[PDB]
């Protein structure tokens, strides 16, 4: 399936470069490949720049903030670059990326919803499953806001349901700077 | 299952055989396009480019199509690179697989003489409460128009014709293809 | 099922015999029948006595519902209706639809109210078509929520975007229901 | 199934009173049933008109056919009421009802569209399949063009996705010919 | 699912009463010996009046089918067959077993005929022993197809050899039924 | 199943018993058998002097439950005719043929099948030795019945019965299985 | 699975054979197979277009344009393709054989060939069941025009011939034309 | 798989010129052995291939493509069975070139008829038959040549399964030598 | 599996050795292995003795008879060591060694039993696979008896039902010569 160029694999060739693929669900083994990657990065020259390309529907809200925890946490500005989809946490790392290198290639489809799960259990389990929950809607929420440069209450009514976007209209809202052409 | 070829170098090598022919820029995408495929083809597209724009990179299609959003992944990136990218297809591009065809440099998208071509319209599903299903189907609607505007400047068909053509299951030959504007010529 | 005595009825049947009928469970094309049969032999026997419908469904198929919601107003009697436990979706329009100062809940009932449910598959004119289809029956639906309760279209519009529980008594000052029985 | 007092079940108490229920799927097994009460009802008095109730989503077109030749060929009248839902063979059955006695509860949802079908094997049997699907919508079409008085061409372009009407329209396009308040 | 009628008799029994057999769904053998226990009934209550065989059937068992075919030519009594809606493959073979003369199908009945399905498995010597049984068994259908359209047994080969569809008027025009009854 | 009027109600089985006749259909299970078993000694009881008619079409089943069926047919005083229709293969053939000799028939059209006993054995040598034994023996004795009952010899039957062996009606009165086709 | 020989290069024993243009097509013929297959054989004619291309062939069939994207590489490459059945070439197998180039098309002497007619299904609106029949019988018909070339058998022959499951010896299908020479 | 000092066992046994054929016959495992077979012709046809034989049989077409493989080679290929060969495992081990046909002396092996299946439409399974007899004949026919058996007899002696001893396949015809 | 340092795998160094792990269940694919291996250390030194180390609970009937009858075959004496269990086919390989050389460590667990299998079918096709499972249960027990002196009939009454044995009841049996300590 992945070819070699001389002698790397065809990701690891990228990786010399400073390019970071994020691609399919957003799990705890990707977040682990991806934040040892930065890390490497980082320590190799925090003076270059990291270019973190995303082609991603979400998945773990846990394991997205684990990376973008740890982009914001290196020295190097980590470029963000959608291609084909961003949705739920991939528009989220998406947005972190450093203000003013946040793109998107011009048919990319982005996302931004309320974070989804699950309780069961005795009313007391339910409701500390609610309250985390709704904590964590939260918390994304005040990210984005400053993220965007939207008001907390604009995220929260645009949030409600899915809200898909247009490259340009991602532009506008402030998810992300440029498309690029 | 995947053969290995030995070349006799000065300098001191061994390949598969699809990392052989892309050191000749030959990229092969095939089978159901699916992000994975997507994240290799495009990592290729990137690697050949920077290695050197001035020369042309070959993209053979044998695809029955996939993912709507993986597609347009290789689709923007088949634009971004500087390098032209010449696209053949070999038994069958259907759905993605057709508009990654039509994709390629003008002048430089070719068929195989029994090559089969289809185009349609894009397929999903939604669950849920109206509203959940209103937003799907708006969306999927502006899917559609993108994708169908796309087509009528890649074929130079006008609008009204790829959405009448497009409305069903449309199998073509090479030859008919070659007439509609998918493509610019049958090799033998 | 219990049996009482000379005739012998089972107890459903018995219930009907002094126009009670039982609507329980999800509500199918196979209970709207059963409903419907039984409302139209009550009407034919007698017209001036009033009909009870008492209630206790989740819901379920929009068309069964509808089906039994026609009939109910087509009959001639005053059909009664009572919730006991729950009345969801499906559930609580027949509950509104009972005859206006006929319409009651137990004390303790659960009523709920939301948008409808469904799926669509294939192509994008095959989901543009299942889309208007649901939206027009939201909206139908929703008209005749606001005529039964007397609230303006928009505000039943917002009220049923999501689950929305209520009490009796809540049920009660949102019109759905005319009286809270103890 | 309540039980009313002779001692009948509901519904064959209905059935003294000519009404049939046509509920649910079209199978053989329901067609089998519905042409029995059609045949027996027509027996026992040819003057008097019989009542059939519909409320189904279709089903066999076949176990359909069976019903609506039983339906012409009784001697007495046939008056369909929709309650709930005709679609697809439901509608089909409607429609043939008598002329002048065809009826639709005021929100009765009818669903007109073309036949469905699967075929698995040689290209020779997809061919006998496919001209056999074709031959049966050509058919249905132009008895349809007859029930509702729409030409041919009208019936095709409206039946060629699935079309849902009010009983309102359904009354306009000719399936009906009164919506009962 | 299936109503009674007033002596109280279940529809279907009082359609015997008046010497109608219902052969509905798929031929098996539990199928074959209720029709085989009312073609046996009638006919010893009364030889001289026909007996009615409505068929709306798919197929199915050549065997059970052949059983109820048997039956027919056996009892004294004439035999008439209806189709409603289709008779295919064991279905259709029934519907041209009636009396010649009295094999009817209703406007837009379907009739199909094709050749017998079946499988083996095993050493070559056991698939030649069914290869040998189902041949034989194609053989002795198409002569007595044969025999009932009067067409010649290679036409029916040929004719038989895939899925062969007919409207109610090709049927009569090839023989296996009479008359079309509008 | 429909339900006749003569005021007597009966189910159409039931009236086809009042007048002697047994339906013998499907799978010869230890249920069947013991509903056959029944019918046949009831019929008996109420009069040996009448005879009892079994119409089978089966393809066959437990060998046990079958021998069950054959044992109470020659047990009873009273004659039993066995008409054949549509199918008896196996011990459904088997039972065609123990019907009273003189008065076992097939329709027409019927098929007709013998072959030898199927089973199986799992386990250790011994036990697989054991369940060999015990299927040789079954096939050893059902083929000595067949060469009474049919009158030919038992290195015939055994020749006959090596694979599945399909025959016509007339076939079958050619070699004893029965005595008449019926038309 | 996959034995290794030496040469101070290690070649696993596919890859041997591939640098004396040798290419195994075996088993079931899906896009990944052709997708091998194809490169190999691009390989092949771009390293030298005067040395002969060797194709072994045992395969009962597989996707219809999968095989053609190799039909078509075949016929576009510069070197001469020679083909060899061994065991069994069928359905998309045998239409790859009989387009090695004419002259050089073999089989082993007990190699089972066989032709028939394209498989396929449909399903959903009598409009969508209509447009796949279209597709299968261009199919076909695009298909029978090739063989009736690669075979030098009129048309009407092959579509009689292609009806149903046609197998054929090595030496039936030198005589049919579909190959040059039984080795 | 062990390694020897830097090949795998199995390879190491191909360096000696051993081919091992062990379980099923399919077409991946018949693909091998081809490869294998004609690899070592190529090398040197002079020197003797030794194929190794467990195998409980298999693909009919797997098995005779890997038959006549064996007999287009220059090389002779001996047989030595180990353990099982049944069906087209037998069938190979009688192939192996007359005088060079060996078995272990615990060695099972078995003849029988192919085994199939068909489905569908009496004119399918007509065809089906008259196939899986035909492939029935033609193995026979070689049988025959093989053992210098006549026909008759191996009719009759595959009709059901035939299991026979190391010593009984030598005097059977199918080997030459038992080995001890 | 660890690897140690030339870099072989462990077992690959045990081989260096004249060491054979058999472990597991007796299967084709082992018996291949284990075979390649007895010829390879033959062809290397035929005067050295082989060591063929065994925890395995039975198998493949055939499969184990391939490895019996290689194990005679080699020139080389082939000692055979039983750890933990050798059961059914294994026990049998266990005694197939050298005469002098078979060795159990002193908690090995011994079995012997007959042999199992199945069959279906016509009543001809069960005598068939009952003849041929006593040939083959006939065939094992006049080799056990060799190898142990034990006589035949012994062997047949002691073989009926599952036999377990401690390493000094084996010893004392005869399927082994020498409990190590
Ligand atoms: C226990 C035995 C009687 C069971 C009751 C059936 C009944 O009331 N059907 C409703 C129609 C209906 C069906 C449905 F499924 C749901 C629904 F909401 C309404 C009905 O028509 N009631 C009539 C009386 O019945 C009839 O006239 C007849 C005879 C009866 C055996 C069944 N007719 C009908 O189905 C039809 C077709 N009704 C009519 O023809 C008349 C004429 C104009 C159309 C409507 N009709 C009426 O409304 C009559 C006139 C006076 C009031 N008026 C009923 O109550
Ligand atoms: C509605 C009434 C129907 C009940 C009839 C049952 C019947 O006919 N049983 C068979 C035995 C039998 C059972 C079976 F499961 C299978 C089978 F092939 C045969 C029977 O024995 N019939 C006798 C007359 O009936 C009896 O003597 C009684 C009384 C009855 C309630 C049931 N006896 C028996 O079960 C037994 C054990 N029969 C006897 O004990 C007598 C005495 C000597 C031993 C056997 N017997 C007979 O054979 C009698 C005398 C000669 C003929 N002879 C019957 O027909
Ligand atoms: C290990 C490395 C070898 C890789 C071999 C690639 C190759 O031979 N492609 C085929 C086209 C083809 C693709 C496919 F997917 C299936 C198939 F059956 C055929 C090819 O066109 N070969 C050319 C010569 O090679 C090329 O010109 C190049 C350069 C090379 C890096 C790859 N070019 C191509 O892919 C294409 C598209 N060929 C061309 O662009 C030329 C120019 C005009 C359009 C078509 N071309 C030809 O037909 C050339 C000219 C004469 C014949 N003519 C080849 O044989
Ligand atoms: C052996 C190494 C192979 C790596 C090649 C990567 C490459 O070509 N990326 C594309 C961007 C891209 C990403 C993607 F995921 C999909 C896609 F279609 C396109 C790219 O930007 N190419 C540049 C040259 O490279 C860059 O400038 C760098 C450095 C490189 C290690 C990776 N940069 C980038 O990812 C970005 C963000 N590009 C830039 O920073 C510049 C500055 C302004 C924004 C966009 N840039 C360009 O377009 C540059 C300027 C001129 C054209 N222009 C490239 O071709
Ligand atoms: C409601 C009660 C129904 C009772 C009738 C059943 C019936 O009609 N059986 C068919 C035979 C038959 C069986 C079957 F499974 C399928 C089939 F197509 C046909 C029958 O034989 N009818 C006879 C009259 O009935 C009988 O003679 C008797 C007595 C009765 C209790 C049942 N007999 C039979 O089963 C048999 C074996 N028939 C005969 O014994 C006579 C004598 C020679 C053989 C054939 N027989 C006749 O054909 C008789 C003589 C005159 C015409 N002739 C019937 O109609
Ligand atoms: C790592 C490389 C070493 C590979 C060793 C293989 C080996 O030892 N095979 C056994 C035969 C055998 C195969 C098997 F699958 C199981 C089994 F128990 C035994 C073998 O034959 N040993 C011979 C020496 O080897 C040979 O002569 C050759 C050449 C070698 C590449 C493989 N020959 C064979 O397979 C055959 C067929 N052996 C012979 O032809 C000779 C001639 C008469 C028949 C048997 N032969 C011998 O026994 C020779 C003669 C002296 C003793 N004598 C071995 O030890
Ligand atoms: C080629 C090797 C690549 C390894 C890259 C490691 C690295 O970048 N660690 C991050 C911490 C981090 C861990 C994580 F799991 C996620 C994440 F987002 C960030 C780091 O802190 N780097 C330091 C450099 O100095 C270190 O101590 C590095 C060296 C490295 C071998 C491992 N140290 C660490 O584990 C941590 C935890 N660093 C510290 O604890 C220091 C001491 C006080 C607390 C915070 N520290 C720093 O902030 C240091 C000093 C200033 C900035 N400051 C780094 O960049």
């Known amino acids: 399936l992945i070819p070699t160029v001389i002698a790397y694999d065809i990701y690891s060739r990228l990786l010399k470069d400073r390019i970071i693929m994020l691609s399919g669900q957003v799990t705890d083994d990707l977040a682990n490949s991806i ?4 890390l490497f990065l980082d320590a190799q020259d925090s003076e270059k720049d990291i270019y973190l390309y995303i082609n991603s529907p979400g998945g773990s809200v846990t394991a997205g903030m684990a990376i973008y925890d740890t982009m914001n946490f290196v ?3 980590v470029q963000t670059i ?3 989809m961003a949705a739920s946490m991939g528009s989220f790392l ?10 998107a290639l011009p048919n990319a489809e982005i996302m931004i919803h309320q974070p989804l799960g699950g309780a069961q259990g005795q009313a007391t389990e339910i409701e500390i499953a609610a309250r985390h ?3 964590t809607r939260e918390r994304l929420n ?3 806001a400053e993220r965007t440069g939207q008001p907390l209450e ?7 349901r899915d809200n898909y976007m247009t490259a340009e209209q991602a532009k506008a809202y402030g998810l992300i700077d440029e498309v690029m052409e």
């Open 154 to 160: 604009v995220i929260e009514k645009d949030t409600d």
């Open 133 to 135: 929950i709704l904590q």
């Open 94 to 103: 998406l947005t972190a990326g450093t203000k003013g290198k946040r793109f």
């Open 35 to 38: 934040i040892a990657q930065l």
């Open 75 to 77: 020295k190097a500005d």
């Open 142 to 144: 005040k990210i984005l």
């Open 82 to 84: 959608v291609m084909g």
